[PDB]
């Protein structure tokens, strides 16, 4: 019988700073045990300082990103070139995803940018449109490997102030863009070592008020 | 795990904040209460998307009611819009366990249980989710109508903590709500990480656990 879904592997990661936000993803595309592409980007600039990635089944991922990019275009036409706020983009994507509730997009979706107060924002979606704003989210094949590391290093979970008898927690604080990219690069190198579907290359899209910058880093190709 | 009970001083509504993808802990920071209006609350149990999407939609239908009728929708009518919606999708595989809690003049404090197989029940006490039984255990054994607002808030918080502890698929934090004649009041986010040790020490409970 025909199976309409497939698994293109890869993994994605979104971190939010004080005045910035990053959305990183590996450039490897796979089917079963074969490599399709060592450089097939899946983190896109959708305009209005929104970066988006729909990781899982690439055909559904590309279809969704394509439809959201189109949604942004018609938002400008219908509402006098108004900038689509990250919170508004998130709600719009919920309706795109849930629009196929009974034949879903097989993708874990993440978007990043700045909220209307200029502060870093990351929204994460399930395949059927449930979404939540977070400081931190990993998605895709190696999500289970990366996410607990982020909990420890970004949100400082299970980390107590030395000598306080485990009574005082380590205080939450925003990370610099330099510190976040270190965590992203270490997250992916670690994921590459232990997950076969992760490697080849790492592409990071950083979002500040000044616009969208890119950074590329080699990963292990085995 | 989520509960909602009626008492002397209005309605207590308490929920956990854990999301599960099988045995994978997806989130510990999930909002499982939606604030439809100053006098209406919605609890989301089941499909993360199903509950979120349709209760946000319910809030749009409740807004259209008060525009058209120049009067805040009844808890009964609000609950029945949602119950009549899911009933149209019966058999299609929607997963929704919901309690619609709120106050109106004509009804007073009211709670409606609404699930995806079309069931709609008015009632004083409801516990819903994978940890519903753990919450019922603590809530039932300590529940009285004449509870103070202070004691009722704690029992709701403690009932969730009980389920958060035992049920593997419940945890993260407790989100508390109080609903009066004046509307709903948010009573904060309580991380189980700190709340458990604080309750254990102060209450002298949870003796099963290595202190």
């Amino acid at each position: 019988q025909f199976n309409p879904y497939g698994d293109n592997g890869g993994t994605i990661l979104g971190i939010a700073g004080e005045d910035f936000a990053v959305l990183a993803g590996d450039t490897r595309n796979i089917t079963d045990y074969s490599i399709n592409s060592r450089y097939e980007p899946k983190v896109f600039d959708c305009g209005d300082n929104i970066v988006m990635s729909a990781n899982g089944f690439a055909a559904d991922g590309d279809a969704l990103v394509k439809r959201f990019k189109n949604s942004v275009k018609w938002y400008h036409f219908d509402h006098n070139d108004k900038k689509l706020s990250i919170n508004s983009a998130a709600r719009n994507i919920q309706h795109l995803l849930y629009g196929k509730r009974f034949f879903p997009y097989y993708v874990h979706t993440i978007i990043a940018g700045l909220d209307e107060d200029g502060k870093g924002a990351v929204y994460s979606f399930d395949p059927v449109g449930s979404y939540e704003r977070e400081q931190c989210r990993a998605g895709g094949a190696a999500a289970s490997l990366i996410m607990p590391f982020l909990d420890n290093q970004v949100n400082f979970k299970n980390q107590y102030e030395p000598g306080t008898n485990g009574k005082v927690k380590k205080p939450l604080k925003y990370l610099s863009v330099e510190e976040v990219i270190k965590l992203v690069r270490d997250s992916f190198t670690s994921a590459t070592e232990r997950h076969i579907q992760v490697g080849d290359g790492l592409e990071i899209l950083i979002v500040t008020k000044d616009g969208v910058r890119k950074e590329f880093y080699e990963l292990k190709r085995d | 795990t989520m509960l909602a009970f009626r008492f002397q001083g209005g309605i207590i509504v308490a929920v956990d904040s854990r999301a599960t993808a099988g045995n994978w802990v997806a989130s510990q920071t999930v909002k499982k209460v939606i604030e439809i209006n100053p006098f209406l609350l919605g609890t989301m149990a089941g499909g993360a998307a199903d509950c979120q999407f349709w209760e946000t939609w319910l809030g749009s239908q409740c807004r259209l009611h008060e525009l058209r009728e120049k009067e805040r929708i009844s808890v009964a009518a609000a609950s029945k819009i949602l119950s009549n919606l899911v009933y149209q999708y019966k058999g299609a595989g929607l997963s929704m366990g919901t309690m619609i809690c709120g106050y109106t003049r004509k009804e007073g404090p009211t709670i409606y249980y609404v699930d995806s197989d079309g069931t709609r029940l008015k009632g004083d006490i409801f516990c819903v989710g994978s940890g519903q039984t753990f919450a019922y255990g603590v809530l039932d054994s300590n529940y009285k109508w004449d509870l103070s607002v202070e004691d009722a808030l704690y029992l709701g918080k403690r009932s969730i903590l009980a389920a958060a502890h035992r049920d593997a698929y419940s945890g993260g934090s407790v989100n508390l709500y109080h609903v009066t004649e004046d509307g709903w009041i948010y009573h904060g986010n309580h991380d189980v990480g700190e709340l458990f040790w604080k309750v254990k020490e102060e209450e002298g409970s949870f003796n099963n656990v290595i202190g």
Binding site: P127, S130 | R18, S27, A45, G47, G131, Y169, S170
Partner: peptide, 4 residues
Amino acid sequence: XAYX
């Protein structure tokens, strides 16, 4: 998908 996620699903208390």
